[PDB]
Scaffold this active site. Sequence first.
Site, PDB file in Angstrom:
ATOM      1  N   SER A 287     -36.630  34.535  22.310  1.00 33.86           N
ATOM      2  CA  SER A 287     -37.285  35.186  21.165  1.00 33.86           C
ATOM      3  C   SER A 287     -37.018  34.353  19.905  1.00 33.86           C
ATOM      4  CB  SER A 287     -36.920  36.622  20.933  1.00 33.86           C
ATOM      5  OG  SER A 287     -35.541  36.874  20.812  1.00 33.86           O
TER       6      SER A 287
ATOM      7  N   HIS B 232     -21.448  29.983  32.860  1.00 32.94           N
ATOM      8  CA  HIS B 232     -21.663  31.005  33.888  1.00 32.94           C
ATOM      9  C   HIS B 232     -20.462  31.306  34.761  1.00 32.94           C
ATOM     10  CE1 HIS B 232     -26.037  30.002  33.001  1.00 32.94           C
ATOM     11  NE2 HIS B 232     -25.584  30.994  32.250  1.00 32.94           N
TER      12      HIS B 232
ATOM     13  N   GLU C 190     -24.911  24.127  37.165  1.00 29.10           N
ATOM     14  CA  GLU C 190     -25.503  24.647  38.412  1.00 29.10           C
ATOM     15  C   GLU C 190     -25.427  23.659  39.559  1.00 29.10           C
ATOM     16  OE1 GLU C 190     -29.752  25.469  37.663  1.00 29.10           O
ATOM     17  OE2 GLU C 190     -29.390  26.121  35.587  1.00 29.10           O
TER      18      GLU C 190
ATOM     19  N   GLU D 112     -28.700  34.294  39.303  1.00 28.00           N
ATOM     20  CA  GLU D 112     -29.680  33.622  40.189  1.00 28.00           C
ATOM     21  C   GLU D 112     -29.280  33.641  41.655  1.00 28.00           C
ATOM     22  OE1 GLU D 112     -30.359  29.927  38.186  1.00 28.00           O
ATOM     23  OE2 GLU D 112     -31.100  30.975  36.294  1.00 28.00           O
TER      24      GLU D 112
ATOM     25  N   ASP E 234     -27.389  20.652  37.826  1.00 27.28           N
ATOM     26  CA  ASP E 234     -28.000  20.967  36.525  1.00 27.28           C
ATOM     27  C   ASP E 234     -26.747  20.871  35.630  1.00 27.28           C
ATOM     28  OD1 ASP E 234     -29.019  21.647  33.996  1.00 27.28           O
ATOM     29  OD2 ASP E 234     -30.161  23.369  34.853  1.00 27.28           O
TER      30      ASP E 234
ATOM     31  N   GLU F 217     -30.292  17.301  36.574  1.00 30.27           N
ATOM     32  CA  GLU F 217     -30.980  17.928  35.452  1.00 30.27           C
ATOM     33  C   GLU F 217     -30.136  17.966  34.166  1.00 30.27           C
ATOM     34  OE1 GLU F 217     -32.625  21.878  36.513  1.00 30.27           O
ATOM     35  OE2 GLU F 217     -32.903  22.369  34.348  1.00 30.27           O
TER      36      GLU F 217
ATOM     37  N   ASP G 205     -34.982  19.437  31.173  1.00 33.27           N
ATOM     38  CA  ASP G 205     -35.140  20.911  31.016  1.00 33.27           C
ATOM     39  C   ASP G 205     -35.028  21.173  29.499  1.00 33.27           C
ATOM     40  OD1 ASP G 205     -35.037  23.727  30.935  1.00 33.27           O
ATOM     41  OD2 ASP G 205     -33.201  23.883  32.007  1.00 33.27           O
TER      42      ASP G 205
ATOM     43  N   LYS H 136     -41.473  25.528  33.052  1.00 32.65           N
ATOM     44  CA  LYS H 136     -41.219  26.983  32.891  1.00 32.65           C
ATOM     45  C   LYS H 136     -42.454  27.491  32.158  1.00 32.65           C
ATOM     46  CE  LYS H 136     -36.090  26.928  32.671  1.00 32.65           C
ATOM     47  NZ  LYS H 136     -34.992  26.563  31.694  1.00 32.65           N
TER      48      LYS H 136
ATOM     49  N   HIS I 274     -38.008  29.113  37.959  1.00 29.23           N
ATOM     50  CA  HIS I 274     -37.754  30.540  37.685  1.00 29.23           C
ATOM     51  C   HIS I 274     -37.013  30.526  36.328  1.00 29.23           C
ATOM     52  CE1 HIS I 274     -33.279  30.410  39.521  1.00 29.23           C
ATOM     53  NE2 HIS I 274     -33.467  29.485  38.602  1.00 29.23           N
TER      54      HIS I 274
ATOM     55  N   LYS J 214     -37.467  25.356  42.036  1.00 32.90           N
ATOM     56  CA  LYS J 214     -36.073  25.813  41.787  1.00 32.90           C
ATOM     57  C   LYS J 214     -36.256  27.301  41.578  1.00 32.90           C
ATOM     58  CE  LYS J 214     -32.569  25.119  38.105  1.00 32.90           C
ATOM     59  NZ  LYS J 214     -32.471  24.414  36.789  1.00 32.90           N
TER      60      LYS J 214
HETATM   61 ZN   LIG Z   1     -31.680  23.505  33.341  1.00 35.65          ZN
END
Ligand SMILES: [Zn+2]
EC number: 4.2.1.11
Lengths: 436, 436
Positions: free
Chosen positions: B39, B159, B168, B211, B246, B295, B320, B345, B373, B396
């Site tokens: 946003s 994460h 990731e 995820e 990633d 990535e 990305d 994306k 995603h 992915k």
């Molecule tokens: Zn990424």
Amino acid sequence: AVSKVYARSVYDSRGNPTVEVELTTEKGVFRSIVPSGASTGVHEALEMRDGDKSKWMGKGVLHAVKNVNDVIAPAFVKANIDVSDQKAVDDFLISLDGTANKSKLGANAILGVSLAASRAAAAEKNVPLYKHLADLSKSKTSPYVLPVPFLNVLNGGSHAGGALALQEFMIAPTGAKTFAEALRIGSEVYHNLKSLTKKRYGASAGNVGDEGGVAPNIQTAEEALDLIVDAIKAAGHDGKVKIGLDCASSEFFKDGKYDLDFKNPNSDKSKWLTGPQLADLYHSLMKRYPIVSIEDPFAEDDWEAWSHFFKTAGIQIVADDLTVTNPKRIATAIEKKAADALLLKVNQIGTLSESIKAAQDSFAAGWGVMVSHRSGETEDTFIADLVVGLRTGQIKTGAPARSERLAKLNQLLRIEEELGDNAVFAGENFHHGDKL
Amino acid sequence: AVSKVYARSVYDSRGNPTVEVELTTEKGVFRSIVPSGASTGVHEALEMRDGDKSKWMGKGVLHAVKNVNDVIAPAFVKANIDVSDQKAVDDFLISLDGTANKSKLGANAILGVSLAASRAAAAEKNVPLYKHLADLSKSKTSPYVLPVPFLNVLNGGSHAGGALALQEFMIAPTGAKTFAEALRIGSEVYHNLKSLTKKRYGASAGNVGDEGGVAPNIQTAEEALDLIVDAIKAAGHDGKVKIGLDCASSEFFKDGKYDLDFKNPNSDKSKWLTGPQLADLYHSLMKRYPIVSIEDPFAEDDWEAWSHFFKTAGIQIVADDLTVTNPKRIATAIEKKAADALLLKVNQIGTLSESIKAAQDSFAAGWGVMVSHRSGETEDTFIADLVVGLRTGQIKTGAPARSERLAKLNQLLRIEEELGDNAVFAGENFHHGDKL
Ligand SMILES: [Zn+2]
Ligand SMILES: [Zn+2]
């Protein structure tokens, strides 16, 4: 008329194979995806698994898929069955199997066909699935009842590290005025719980179990319930949200006693509790926390402890492992006045007809019915339409996290919007939604 | 012709509200559910959020839903647009918004309409969605290409707890011969990883991130990769499965240097690495592990470090945060030879037409395209049909866990079965699926 029946292997929410069935009629292709069930099952319908440790770790469903395609489909097509006649569909499938537990063809193979047919009958009649299921179950339709969702928020027992022996903690927004409001409040509680969790236990604690709830390492039941009360308070919904527990007590029943430290693993047997002592511990929690429902408080065959407890409970008592959606078991449960609510798992019995009869027998005894998801769920929304069709007023379909769970909750949002003034939210009358 | 456009609020896989659009034509009602986006977004299309801390913690989409219903719908209906003309659809929406970042109507409101229209055009043309998207993107259709799925299996960085700064870790079964086999092998690896995880780190470690990957408390990159290699080995697929990383390096870029212990929080700056030092650490990992894709190895504006690295990389380098699916950014990335693959994306740019142009520009520069995603996903399977329509050969879309992820993977299973001999699995040629 049905022109084709086909099955394929797809994946459940845990990444294990499950059966997807597509039924073709003059109106289109109707699909059903079955949730994972049990392949070893006394008192329950058995799903068929390949057992080839070299593929999917022995959980393939190739046989099951074979049963559908090579055995059921040709027979089904030739039988020329009216899909609007659900019982004719189901009797046909059962007869094809010929076992009491569907162990010949597999409950997963049979269920897939049984549910797709119902989708196809709705199509034909030109009504939403929930209206069709309302018809088949002979439920009141003025108005329809939207359920209070019992949302999984925190897990203990076998599902978590820590000492906590009780398996599931749910919140139920009984105070909301509409299904959309109940879901909004329920998600706000959940998010606050997640922030509190990460804050008190670590980023780790914020990861989710199979049904979307957190599983921090908690030591006691009061610890878990205090965390939940804080979350409710933090979201500003004190009074509007009640707690539901799933003790899954069969997991810690040993030598005729209940081991609350079963993860011990030097659990002091001097501390194991008898049924009566355990009942006192529940009464205790029930006095301090807004608990309105307790599932499986005693072990699957400890009939006397359920009966005893039930006498003074005063809140809804849900049978899950006690009954395993098995009509003979339900009958005994009713007879012994062991509980007053049946957890309904369609794949535990194997056909839609037998699922509806089990609910009807329950309702007839004055019991409530809580429609439930399985551990291994799919993107199929079937149980959303089924809880509305049955008018139960209560569903357990996971936390407001993970789309195999939200797919059902989103479906209830759509149904509610579609019904307009023809729907009422069960709210505090969840227990007896069928009679509103 | 489109007779009605409607939107409603539903929930994403994280339990936050998102927009669902239904478009009605003479052929039925077509739906699209948009994933959550940003946003606040420089270089990206902005989704509109209510900001009312008293509802959904400030994440409602009531305004967005309002924009669709009260503003776009009447205009759209009156414009009489041919839905088969996707660019006419999209230009219409953009023109209605009038901003570069869709901040007037909200990218979530615009995207919802843009995707539903494409479903409606497929219906009309009488072809599967993927064939329609193939048409719109002018992709080869003899044969179709099924993608290697880059499955999330383990998360670090922001994460997870632990010191691990890389965000990731994915596995890609490039060695399989069909999409179904790649998914089966990929799930077997995943399950073995989960057992090893719980065994070495605790029952806690086995819970999943947004995820579907695990997030044990790991200290180093070698620790994570060794765990993954053990899982691959344990499942018996050594050689058939490659690793993808990633780094999300923008998260630890500070003072012109990279802090590998950014969770520190007394991280020794004497230990921060420059671009060149960081490149040496990657080269190191690349020599010991079967890494075939990296990535975001460098920060979103550290152009010189990407260029430098790219020169000697030798594996696929995915942009990305560098590109945020922004055509001006892509153009610069191509020009500077900063990478050779675009993470796509759709909700980052806001319209299907603009998503297809970004992929086409990428392909034209010899780049690969990895369809992705979002963190907050839904039960909508749109990106499954889109990766096949675009012929990218790589997607992915999460771990083989959580149905917002499996819904796409199940959809690819169905597409593969439907195409029969008209489909080839990208396998080792994933990077350039468009040219197979
Ligand atoms: Zn990424
Ligand atoms: Zn239970």
